[PDB]
Write a protein that binds this DNA or RNA. Structure first.
Ligand SMILES: Nc1nc2c(ncn2[C@@H]2O[C@H](COP(=O)(O)OP(=O)(O)OP(=O)(O)O)[C@@H](O)[C@H]2O)c(=O)[nH]1
Ligand SMILES: [Mg+2]
Lengths: 326, 174, 1068
DNA sequence: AAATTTTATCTCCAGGCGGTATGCACTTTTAACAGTCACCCCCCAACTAA
DNA sequence: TTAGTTGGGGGGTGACTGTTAAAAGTGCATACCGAACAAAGATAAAATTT
């Protein structure tokens, strides 16, 4: 269920947070699902440049009227951020688009990885499908595909409380530690910028704004905490051993290491690789008996890099394309 | 260790207190009475003992149980963890020692024949800590033949041993 | 030596002490039970202390003189343990486990009467009275009444011991008193012929005139449809083989040797690599590794046996007797043969566990038959039964093979019973873990002595699909590279996966038939399921004769391979390959930053797709070349609805064009006066160009293209290649060769032909529906009425869809414009075929999408919109074409939905007599098996407690009924074709025969269709459903609704079925 | 009992996820004190067959 | 590589026979988690909720 913002003071606060960047504050702010456009109105008043991506056609004509005579600052585009670059291969229907086509239409040029941040994207995560959108973006980021082909795109979008706690789990908190937290902590630098209860936001469904008072009282029991979190892709994410070609093996290693949580690293290493587990564990700087839930993400990266860097063995992994779709 | 004796003892059972009540009297009753006979007499008394005494003993046992549980709850809190780790290591050491003792005794009970004696040991027996120092200082025939006899005699004892182990099913011992 | 003297005295004292303590109160088996009841314990005490040699027999008499749902998993395992201990001849272990379980309060409740009876029988076979009395005391203590088998065990014990008749007359006079009948004693299933002989001797000692019931003449079926087949009055010409008796006996001996071996070796058909140094080194390393693995497996098996025996000795269940069933060498060879054929990609843990247990059972059954002594009986019986199927030999009176097999004197047939599913899975898991742990290999095979560390051959790796994870066993890459390098020339097949070399054994009962030694299921289902077998075995024995005879007749058809077609196929396979024709290409001819990864992924996908097709083709071609100059037979069995399928999987007549091209009949029949015409018409039908023209025009077109036929027959690959353009290329080439040989001969009428000719039925399901409803329009539409030119619905559907598409594209929408000429019969065939079976629009789209995907000329980017358009228009065309068919479908669906609502599954009986049942139930729970490596999750089949699934029962009822009526017709047609001397094999709706007998087979088909559908199938179904389900008045209102639905069948139309006899294109 | 939510989608040719946590019911084991006798381990040398 | 062997001493504890009650062990059962990404559109019965 879409949860567009309506409040004005909250809009001003969010505009101040978004445009608080010191170097050239008005970045081209791609906004996902502005809906009624109070947030984009505040952003435009604060001097920024906004391109609106609507999945819903009805908000398109309304938003253009707000943008009339705004000196080309507002450019409405009918596109969905999480539907970018479908992997099916047919003709691309209007609700979806293409990253290359959109970025050429807007005139944004590709920028190398080592250079500074080209763009910034704001919006909100899907209400029910946060898991799916974190995985899709992670595959896009690790493979340098979709939008991340054009540099290091900034993403600042509200996320739920439970998924925020799952994403920021650590070895100190083992019950929530898992693969997604590891990959997202290795890939980016996540910080918290603002907090807001569900009551501040209002939910718009297909029928319209929620006019039910009984559901509103029922929604009162459904309060949670929405965290505004900011992701910046890390400059040194990619190394010689960890390349956009080898991310599948690392993903399989991470998914295998949490298949049986209460087990030492040696037990998983014996299955995954034919090499000597003792030697690798000694090289990375760990004791013989070390549980996987006590392993920091950088330790996982060091383990994978150490295994891949070995040159004596002609066969270093057992993972193969056959293990996919089976 | 210090923590071992520091750990409190559990309350003694009701029948044990009943036995302790009449144990000194039964000792004076018959000087020739032994521990087993006295225990069986006390067991017979418990067979003929009334139930009101059992109930009052059980109430006292509850009182001692609350006292003991409160005391051990207090004691378990104030201890340092390092002595706890030492105590747990030493209790598993004690358990392993108990298991080894039981294994050794089971082996002795299963008719274990004597191992080949050494000549140096026969010399010590013939000569008859100081004793060890003296025999070592003197250290710096018949036993060999006896050991040769032991080799000729104990080897078929192993061969003789196997059939009983087969009959009693202890094949894994072989 | 004072010390030695003391040692001897102490050892003597310790020995005496230990002896006394062991004698009164260590790993010692327990015999005397521990009895709970005070009276029973005192009785046993006084019995044991009464005499040094207690009077066990009269106490046995006195013990039974006074006579004062589904089993759980643990009970199922214990019963299997106790039954297996008898076969293995380990009785003390079973007795010890029984006393231990009887000892404790909780584990006493587990034991039931059957376990006591089994141990009692086991002790009786040895004639031991003391242990028998102990078990009787046990069963009396448990509070149970001895049954007939308990008396049988005692009688067998007395007979074997040859003890005085007094206890015997006392026992029989009681057996009369209690109400047990001595006649029921000799018909118990759980008895052997030796035990029956012994109890018969024991009874004969007391009663001299005791006579077993006299044997009866075999019954004969008297059903309305099968009366003509089994009539003893008439003229019969039964077919005979073309081989002498001695040749058939030699072939039977060869097949027996092959089945006893359990393995066969086939020389690989790959291009033989040049034997360089590399190949020799690889083969040497492979041999050394195989020897080391053999020794390691032997040691591991011995250690596991010791551990399991020790576990049993502590009073708990384990798999020790099951491991004792087979010899060590056979198990080791089975385990080494499994490893040799493991694919490089890997195999699942559960699949390996299932396969390993299934292979163990078959070898156990074969070994039991060999040891018991039934192989000699089979060898004596078959050599006499083979006089019926020999050219030189003669029989006093011709008859069906099953009738002669029975009349000759049937050998006593007993077969082992399947193990419980938990035992099967546990044994498979144990063997898989042993295989994984035992095998090891050097780290660096290519580099000699680079390092001495050892790594496992097989690894356990998780595979994740969506959220779910699956365990997978995968070989080490170096081992796969070594296997590829070695290029060994031998392939290995299982005995039951290779066509038989001798005539198949006649089917005589649901437990006999097909392969001579190995067990074959009459109905192919999952291992756990047993409902179909129960329904088959609970019916009058004479009802199944039609099905058994049809299966036996289909089994006895001699085959042979085609030389020229096989030679041409081998030429393309060994070289670069021809993918267009159907011969897979060698992997060598492969296509071979994110862009680089995408290219590599595409190439890898192509290679992976090619590598499986090449392996399957390799297996089929190796099997085909091994049978180049031999005559082989293929046995047949049914699915759970009646359709008949061959048993050998790889090489049979149900596969693709290559498989059907490589086969031909082994008996030659002269073409006669009307054979060349049928050969030419078959050629035109295989070509597929003239699919909508009368027979005359097809024959004329065959005459017109004679030049191309004679060119393609003489020079197959270097000529004009006209045969490549046919719909079936390979079969067309063989027909061309046969036609050329026929015409070039001096007398075409005298030429013998060994080539089968196919006759197919058009829209068979709709034909059966129209016959059931006796609709006139429907029958006229599907060629059930006389006509001059063939008629088909699927072409009319395409014409209507094309008209709508043209009118739509006139308005100019893109998708309707794209598909200008892609509206064909093939794209709209399977949808209109399955609308009457209840296909959904979601389903219809996934059929049209799949059909449009493979066109290769249609732009492969508009499929998503083309499928959605085509299915809307097909359903917009199909609203009002079928009426009676849809009425019958609605009645059947409603009846199955309401039957499934009451909590019972749907059942019906085929017109021939075979009973059918639908096994759809909701799966409430799945079991798990904890173990060393991983916990296997497996489905428990056969759980009848779960509720039925209304959605599956309602959707599967319309198709299964029609398919059953489809197979009843073939079996009638086959049975009545046999009497006229024809050769008949079938592929569901297509019937094959020699080129000369097509007219006779057509007449028989047209007659038996009318005979089958003259009976009131629908009314009989309604009556059976009313009697079976509505009989119980427990729920009055629901049963009333069910009866109202069941007693309303659709009314028939006005169509005389006699016109089918005069329809030319009903089967063509 | 009606409504809303969720789910499967014509059939046959023999197929199914794995790990961790908490709970219940019943059997098995262990420490509580008695006193006296017996047995084994040290104490440190010496050495020897598994 | 190490437990077992003989001497004079010493030390700790095993047995015994006894009931009692707490603590551990064993087999079965149910529930929740992973939500490896990857467009879209269709229809009515099963499934859960108030
Ligand atoms: N339910 C169902 N039945 C099928 C399916 N495919 C084939 N059949 C049955 O098999 C029978 C013969 O099918 P085919 O020989 O392939 O085609 P056809 O229906 O006979 O029509 P023609 O190709 O002209 O002979 C049909 O009558 C169907 O009853 C299917 O996919 N689903
Ligand atoms: Mg057909």
């Amino acid at each position: 269920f879409k949860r567009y913002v309506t409040d004005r003071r909250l809009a001003e606060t969010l505009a101040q947070i978004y445009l608080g960047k010191p170097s050239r504050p008005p970045h081209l702010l791609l906004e996902c699902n502005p809906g009624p456009g109070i947030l984009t109105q505040a952003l435009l008043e604060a001097g920024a440049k906004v391109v609106a991506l609507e999945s819903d056609k009805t908000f398109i004509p309304h938003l253009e009227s707000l943008g009339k005579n705004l000196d080309g600052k507002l450019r409405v585009i009918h596109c969905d951020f999480f539907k970018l670059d479908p992997r099916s291969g047919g003709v691309i229907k209007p609700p979806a688009m293409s990253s290359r086509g959109l970025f050429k239409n807007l005139g944004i040029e590709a920028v190398p990885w080592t250079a500074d941040i080209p763009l910034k994207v704001v919006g909100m995560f899907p209400s029910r499908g946060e898991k799916r959108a974190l995985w899709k973006l992670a595959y896009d980021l690790y493979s340098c595909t979709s939008i991340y082909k054009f540099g290091r795109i900034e993403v600042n979008m509200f996320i739920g409380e439970k998924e925020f706690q799952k994403l920021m789990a650590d070895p100190g908190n083992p019950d929530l530690y898992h693969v997604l937290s590891v990959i997202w902590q290795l890939a980016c630098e996540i910080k918290v910028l603002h907090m807001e209860p569900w009551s501040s936001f209002d939910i718009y469904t297909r029928k319209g704004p929620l006019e039910n008072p009984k559901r509103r009282e029922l929604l009162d029991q459904l309060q949670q905490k929405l965290y505004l979190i900011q992701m910046i892709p890390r400059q040194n994410l990619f190394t010689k051993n960890l390349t956009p070609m080898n991310y599948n093996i690392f993903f399989h290693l991470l998914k295998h290491c949490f298949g049986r949580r209460s087990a030492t690293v040696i037990d998983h290493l014996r299955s995954l690789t034919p090499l000597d587990a003792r030697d690798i564990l000694m090289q990375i700087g760990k004791q013989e008996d070390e549980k996987v839930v006590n392993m920091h993400p950088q330790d996982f990266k060091t383990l994978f890099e150490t295994i891949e860097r070995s040159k004596d063995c002609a066969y270093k992994w057992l993972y193969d394309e056959t293990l996919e779709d089976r | 260790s210090s923590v071992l004796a520091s750990c409190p003892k559990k309350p003694v059972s009701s029948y044990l207190r009943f036995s302790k009540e009449q144990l000194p009297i039964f000792k004076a009753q018959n000087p020739d009475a032994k521990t087993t006979e006295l225990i069986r007499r006390i067991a017979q008394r418990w067979r003929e003992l009334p139930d009101s005494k059992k109930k009052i003993y059980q109430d006292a046992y509850r009182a001692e149980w609350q006292v003991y549980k409160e005391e051990i709850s207090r004691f378990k809190e104030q201890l340092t963890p390092s002595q706890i780790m030492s105590l747990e290591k030493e209790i598993m050491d004690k358990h392993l020692k108990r298991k080894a003792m039981t294994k050794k005794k089971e082996l002795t009970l299963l008719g274990k024949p004597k191992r080949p004696r050494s000549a140096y040991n026969v010399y010590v027996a013939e000569r008859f800590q100081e004793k060890l120092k003296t025999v070592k200082e003197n250290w710096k025939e018949l036993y060999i033949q006896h050991a040769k006899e032991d080799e000729t005699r104990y080897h078929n004892e192993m061969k003789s041993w196997e059939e009983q182990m087969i009959e009693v099913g202890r094949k894994d011992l072989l | 030596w004072a010390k030695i003297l003391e040692k001897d005295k102490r050892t003597q004292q310790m020995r005496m002490q230990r002896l006394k303590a062991k004698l009164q109160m260590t790993r010692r088996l327990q015999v005397e039970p521990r009895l709970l009841s005070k009276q029973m314990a005192g009785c046993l005490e006084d019995c044991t202390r009464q005499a040094p040699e207690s009077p066990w027999e009269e106490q046995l008499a006195r013990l039974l003189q006074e006579a004062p749902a589904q089993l759980s998993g643990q009970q199922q395992r214990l019963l299997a343990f106790f039954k297996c201990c008898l076969l293995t001849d380990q009785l003390p272990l079973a007795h010890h486990l029984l006393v231990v379980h009887h000892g404790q309060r909780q584990k006493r409740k587990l034991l039931t009467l059957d376990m006591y009876n089994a141990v009692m029988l086991g002790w009786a076979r040895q004639g031991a009275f003391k242990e028998l009395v102990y078990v009787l005391f046990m069963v009396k203590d448990a509070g149970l009444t001895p049954d007939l088998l308990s008396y049988a065990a005692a009688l067998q014990c007395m007979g074997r011991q040859d003890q005085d008749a007094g206890t015997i007359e006392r026992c029989l006079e009681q057996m009369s008193q209690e109400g047990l009948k001595l006649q029921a004693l000799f018909t118990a299933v759980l008895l052997s012929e030796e035990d029956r002989a012994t109890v018969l001797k024991a009874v004969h000692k007391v009663k001299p005139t005791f006579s077993l019931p006299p044997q009866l003449p075999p019954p004969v079926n008297t059903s309305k449809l099968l009366r003509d087949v089994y009539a003893k009055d008439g003229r019969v010409s039964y077919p005979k083989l073309h081989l002498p008796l001695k040749t058939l006996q030699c072939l039977f001996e060869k097949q027996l040797h092959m089945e006893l071996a359990s393995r066969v070796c086939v020389v690989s058909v790959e291009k033989p690599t040049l034997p360089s140094k590399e190949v020799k080194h690889a083969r040497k390393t492979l041999k050394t590794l195989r020897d080391q693995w053999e020794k390691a497996l032997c040691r591991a098996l011995r250690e596991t046996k010791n551990r399991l025996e020790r576990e049993v000795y502590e009073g708990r269940f384990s798999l020790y007797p099951f491991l004792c069933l087979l010899d060590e060498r056979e198990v080791v060879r089975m385990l080494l043969q499994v490893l040799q054929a493991l694919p490089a990609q890997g195999e699942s843990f559960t699949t390996l566990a299932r396969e390993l247990s299934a292979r163990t059972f078959s070898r156990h059954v074969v070994q039991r038959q060999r040891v018991s002594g039934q192989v000699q009986a089979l060898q004596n019986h078959y050599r006499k039964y083979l006089c019926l199927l020999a050219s030189d030999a003669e029989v006093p009176e011709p008859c069906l093979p099953r009738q002669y097999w029975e009349e000759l004197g049937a050998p006593e047939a007993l077969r082992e019973q399947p193990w419980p599913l938990p035992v099967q899975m546990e044994l498979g898991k144990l063997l898989a873990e042993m295989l994984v742990q035992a095998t090891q290999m050097p780290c660096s095979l290519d580099k000699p002595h680079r390092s001495s560390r050892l790594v496992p051959v097989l690894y356990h790796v998780y595979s994740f699909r969506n959220v779910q994870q699956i365990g997978i066993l995968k070989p080490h890459p170096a081992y796969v590279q070594l296997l590829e390098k070695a290029a060994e020339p031998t392939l290995t097949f299982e005995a039951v996966d290779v066509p038989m070399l001798c005539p198949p054994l006649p089917w005589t009962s649901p437990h006999s038939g097909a392969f001579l030694l190995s067990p074959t299921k009459l109905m192919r289902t999952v291992e756990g399921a047993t409902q179909h077998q129960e329904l088959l075995e609970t019916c009058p024995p004479t009802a199944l004769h039609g099905a058994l005879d049809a299966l036996t007749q289909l089994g006895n058809c001699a085959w042979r391979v085609n030389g020229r077609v096989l030679d041409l196929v081998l030429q393309l396979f060994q070289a670069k390959g021809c993918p267009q024709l159907g011969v897979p290409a060698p992997p060598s001819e492969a296509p071979q930053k994110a862009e680089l990864r995408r290219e590599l992924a595409h190439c890898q996908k192509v290679a992976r797709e090619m590598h499986s097709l090449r392996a399957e083709a390799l297996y089929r071609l190796s099997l085909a070349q091994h049978l180049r100059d031999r005559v082989f037979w293929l046995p047949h069995n049914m699915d759970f609805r009646g359709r008949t399928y061959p048993c050998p999987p790889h090489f049979n007549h149900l596969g693709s064009d290559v498989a059907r091209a490589l086969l031909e009949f082994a008996q030659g029949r002269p073409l006669g006066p009307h054979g060349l015409d049928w050969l030419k018409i078959h050629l035109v039908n295989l070509t597929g160009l003239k699919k909508r023209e009368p027979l005359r025009k097809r024959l004329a077109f065959a005459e017109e293209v004679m030049d191309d036929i004679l060119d393609s027959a003489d020079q197959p690959l270097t000529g004009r290649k006209w045969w490549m353009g046919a719909e079936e290329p390979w079969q067309t080439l063989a027909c061309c060769m046969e036609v050329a040989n026929a015409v070039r001969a001096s007398d075409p009428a005298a030429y013998v032909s060994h080539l089968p000719v196919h006759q197919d039925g058009s829209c068979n399901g709709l034909q059966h529906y129209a016959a059931l409803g006796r609709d006139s329009v429907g029958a006229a539409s599907v060629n059930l009425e006389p006509s001059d030119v063939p008629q088909d619905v699927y072409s009319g559907v395409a014409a209507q869809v094309e008209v709508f598409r043209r009118q739509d594209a006139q308005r100019g929408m893109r998708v309707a414009q794209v598909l200008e000429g892609f509206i064909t019969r093939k794209v709209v065939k399977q949808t209109v075929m399955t609308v009457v079976y209840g296909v959904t629009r979601y389903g219809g789209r996934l059929q049209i999408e799949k059909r449009l995907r493979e066109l290769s000329d249609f732009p492969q980017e508009f499929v998503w919109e083309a499928s959605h358009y085509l299915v809307r228009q097909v359903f917009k065309s199909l609203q009002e074409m079928f009426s009676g068919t849809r009425a019958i479908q609605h009645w059947l669906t409603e009846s199955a939905r309401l039957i499934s609502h009451m909590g019972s599954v749907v059942e019906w009986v085929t017109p021939l007599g075979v009973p059918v049942i639908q096994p759809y139930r909701l799966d409430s729970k799945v079991k798990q098996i904890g173990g060393g490596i991983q916990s296997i999750t497996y489905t428990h089949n056969g759980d009848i407690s779960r509720k039925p699934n209304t959605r599956k029962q309602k959707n599967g009822f319309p198709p299964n009924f029609i398919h059953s009526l489809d197979s009843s017709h073939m079996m009638l047609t086959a049975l009545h074709c046999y009497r006229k001397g024809l050769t008949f094999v079938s592929v569901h709706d297509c019937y094959w025969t020699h080129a000369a007998d097509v007219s006779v087979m057509n007449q028989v088909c047209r007659e038996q269709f009318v005979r089958l559908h003259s009976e009131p199938i629908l009314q009989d179904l309604s009556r059976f459903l009313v009697k079976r389900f509505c009989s119980e008045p427990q729920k009055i209102l629901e049963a009333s609704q069910l009866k109202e639905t069941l007693q309303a069948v659709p009314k028939p139309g006005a169509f005389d079925l006699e016109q089918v006899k005069r329809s030319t294109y009903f089967f063509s």
